[PDB]
Amino acid sequence: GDSWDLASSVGLTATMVAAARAVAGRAPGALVNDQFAEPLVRAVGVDFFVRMASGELDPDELAEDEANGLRRFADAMAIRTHYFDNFFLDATRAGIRQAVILASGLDSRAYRLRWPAGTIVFEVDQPQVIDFKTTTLAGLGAAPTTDRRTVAVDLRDDWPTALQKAGFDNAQRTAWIAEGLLGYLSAEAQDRLLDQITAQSVPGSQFATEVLRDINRLNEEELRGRMRRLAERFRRHGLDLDMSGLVYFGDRTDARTYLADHGWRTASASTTDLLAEHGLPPIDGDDAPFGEVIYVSAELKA
């Protein structure tokens, strides 16, 4: 209530993952450099994340637990960014010309990926966050690399109706992503979003997302311990962010079951296997505050 401006609507978690993409992009041999992460974080103007994104916060100068936590998170964002980038590039290489980025936040893919002529990319998010990123990148002189259409409706509200109004065509194949979202949703909110995707999809449509397989009652106290130790490290640098209040530890239908029941084929790629494939250090125990993240790609069957 005490701020009114666009940048103050952007969630800390969106800003944090963008700052980590900025760090990842400077690594020698980086899988991906999101060249818009640093300037978007700077525009958000949360000082801690500006210092992180810019490299003013130097991991060589940090206590070992902080330096290791930042390097492993940057590697998690390297693999995640690579995964979702390659999902879209594979989908358009297979003839898909309609893409939807759900809760698009600070995702710069409509400005940095190659999209074939005739592609439309729809971005769905709450209006202030939509308006923030569009105005910020326009002011930096970064034109989109595709026909880009925003849908300024929170995923909690009637976004399908607004997506149709923006010119979405439910008769052609769609490539959907929901990146960094499903672990923050209730079981009911997850099933509703997967119903909405399915209802707007024709066969040959594709969807990529994550399954946070370890966020459950079995592992709750261990993961809450990781999240409290991380919260303490953030407080030392002037950020108040307790991830434990943002995740749901309760029962749910695994998204992969839910998709299979709705007629999707799925393919699961573990963080463990993607880090090994790309020659990066393992992310486990204390360095995995959400446990093992499973990246999922799905195709709707006829």
Q: Residue 29 or residue 285: which is nearer to Mg ion going by CB?
A: 285
Q: Tell me how far the alpha carbon of residue 101 is from its chain's centroid.
A: 9
Q: Regarding beta strands 175-178 and 98-102, do their DSSP bridges make them parallel or antiparallel, or are they unpaired?
A: parallel
Q: Residue 54 or residue 219: which is nearer to Mg ion going by CB?
A: 219
Residue 155 marked as a ligand binder: yes
Cβ at position 252, least distance to Mg ion in Å: 8
Q: Interior CA angle at 291 toward 72 and 235, to 5°?
A: 60
Furthest-apart CA pair in the chain: how many Å?
55
Position with the least CB separation from Mg ion: 286
Residue 5 marked as a ligand binder: no
In the region spanning residues 136 to 155, those forming contacts with Mg ion, defined by CB under 5 A, are none
Nearest to 77 by CA among 12, 26, 125, 22: 22
How many residues belong to the site for Mg ion (CB under 5 A)? 1
Nearest to 16 by CA among 6, 26, 24, 5: 24
Q: Residue 72 or residue 149: which is nearer to Mg ion going by CB?
A: 72
Q: Residue 103 or residue 288: which is nearer to Mg ion going by CB?
A: 288
Q: Residue 66 or residue 286: which is nearer to Mg ion going by CB?
A: 286
Number of helices (H) and strands (E), helices first, in the chain?
11, 7
Pattern 260-289, Mg ion, x by CB under 5 A? --------------------------x---
Residues 18 and 41: their CA atoms lie apart, in Å, by 7
Pattern 227-266, Mg ion, x by CB under 5 A? ----------------------------------------
Please tell me whether residue 191 binds Mg ion under the rule CB under 5 A.
no
Q: Find out whether 123 and 148 touch, Cβ atoms under 8 Å.
A: yes
Cβ at position 180, least distance to Mg ion in Å: 23
Cβ at position 65, least distance to Mg ion in Å: 5
Nearest to 252 by CA among 213, 296, 196: 213
Residues 267 and 100: their CA atoms lie apart, in Å, by 20
Cβ at position 220, least distance to Mg ion in Å: 16
Cβ at position 268, least distance to Mg ion in Å: 17
Q: Tell me how far the alpha carbon of residue 59 is from its chain's centroid.
A: 23
Q: Residue 109 or residue 256: which is nearer to Mg ion going by CB?
A: 256
Q: Find out whether 290 and 215 touch, Cβ atoms under 8 Å.
A: yes
For residue 281, give the DSSP letter: P
Cβ at position 255, least distance to Mg ion in Å: 12
Tell me the CB-side half-sphere exposure of residue 277, using CA atoms within 13 A: 11
Q: Per the annotation, where are the binding residues for S-adenosyl-L-methionine?
A: 125, 154-155
Q: Per the annotation, where are the binding residues?
A: 125, 154-155
Residues that bind Mg ion (CB under 5 A): 286
